[PDB]
Amino acid sequence: SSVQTAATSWGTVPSIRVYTANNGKITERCWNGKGWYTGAFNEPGDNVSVTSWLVGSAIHIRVYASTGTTTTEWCWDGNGWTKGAYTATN
Amino acid sequence: SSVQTAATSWGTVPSIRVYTANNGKITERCWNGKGWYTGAFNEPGDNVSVTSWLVGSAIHIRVYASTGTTTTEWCWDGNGWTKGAYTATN
Amino acid sequence: SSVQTAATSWGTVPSIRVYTANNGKITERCWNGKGWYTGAFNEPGDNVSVTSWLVGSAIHIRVYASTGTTTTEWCWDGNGWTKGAYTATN
Numbered sequence: 514s515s516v517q518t519a520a521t522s523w524g525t526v527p528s529i530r531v532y533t534a535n536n537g538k539i540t541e542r543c544w545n546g547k548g549w550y551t552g553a554f555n556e557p558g559d560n561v562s563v564t565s566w567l568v569g570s571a572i573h574i575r576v577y578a579s580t581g582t583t584t585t586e587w588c589w590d591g592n593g594w595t596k597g598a599y600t601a602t603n
Numbered sequence: 604s605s606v607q608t609a610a611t612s613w614g615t616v617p618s619i620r621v622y623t624a625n626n627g628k629i630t631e632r633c634w635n636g637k638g639w640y641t642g643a644f645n646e647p648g649d650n651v652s653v654t655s656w657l658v659g660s661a662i663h664i665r666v667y668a669s670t671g672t673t674t675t676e677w678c679w680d681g682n683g684w685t686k687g688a689y690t691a692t693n
Numbered sequence: 694s695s696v697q698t699a700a701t702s703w704g705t706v707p708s709i710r711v712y713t714a715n716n717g718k719i720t721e722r723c724w725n726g727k728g729w730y731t732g733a734f735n736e737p738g739d740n741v742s743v744t745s746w747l748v749g750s751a752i753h754i755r756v757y758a759s760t761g762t763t764t765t766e767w768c769w770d771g772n773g774w775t776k777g778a779y780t781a782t783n
């Protein structure tokens with residue numbers, strides 16, 4: 514029942530995103546330099562990891578959400594969260 | 604009872620920090636290019652994530668320590684660990 | 694029994710590595726811009742974290758694999774995975 518988190522950051526301000534898996538739901542809190550706020554990410558899962566990279570000033574984020582033995586990748590590329598092509602055999 | 608870790612690194616040497624949550628306590632091991640040693644970070648929690656960024660040559664670290672459903676952010680900005688402004692409703 | 698993941702990425706394409714701890718075994722899935730494939734990393738553990746850094750164009754990866762209270766570091770420096778010098782007292 515205890516929460517599990519993952520975190521990523523970019524830039525120098527910086528921007529931070531913290532993902533929390535709690536009771537089967539993953540949610541997102543965001544910092545862009547002045548106050549924490551709730552992000553758009555809402556996906557099911559009991560376990561989360563994240564990585565991100567910049568292309569110029571454009572951030573790209575990949576969140577790996579797992580339920581049971583099944584991992585789904587979620588992608589932020591500037592215009593909403595979409596399901597990514599990641600697969601694994603678990 | 605099994606330990607859970609989080610890791611971050613910066614630079615090219617590199618510097619590495621590995622955080623271990625074990626039996627409700629989070630501790631830190633450090634590498635700055637020649638030998639592992641114990642860091643100053645000691646905070647309670649059963650779950651840990653971390654992110655870091657450089658501003659010039661100055662490292663900034665954020666550790667997200669969770670106990671139950673409560674997440675506390677700890678901040679390294681060059682002069683000791685301090686509690687950060689992160690909040691979430693879990 | 695549920696899987697736990699860790700992820701790292703580098704570059705702008707980017708390269709991504711996702712490590713999955715499942716039933717005591719850690720495995721690796723890789724993206725280098727066009728298709729996911731299975732990486733060379735295979736090590737025991739119930740918990741995984743990862744960090745990576747570039748020296749020029751050369752990637753270096755450290756995977757922290759934990760079983761029980763024992764953490765082993767695995768190193769990629771361009772020519773196969775090797776056990777690293779990390780130790781901790783847990």
Ligand SMILES: OC[C@@]1(O)OC[C@@H](O)[C@@H](O)[C@@H]1O
Nearest residue numbers: 530541543551552553554589
């Ligand atoms: O500014 C917040 C936001 O747009 O940042 C990018 C992603 O983290 C989104 O989920 C999030 O809502």
Ligand SMILES: OC[C@@]1(O)OC[C@@H](O)[C@@H](O)[C@@H]1O
Nearest residue numbers: 620631633641642643644679
């Ligand atoms: O050189 C070690 C150290 O000062 O590095 C910065 C932080 O990781 C501290 O907790 C740690 O003790």
Ligand SMILES: OC[C@@]1(O)OC[C@@H](O)[C@@H](O)[C@@H]1O
Nearest residue numbers: 710721723731732733734769
């Ligand atoms: O191209 C894939 C690969 O060589 O990339 C570097 C490491 O992630 C290896 O485990 C992996 O097999």
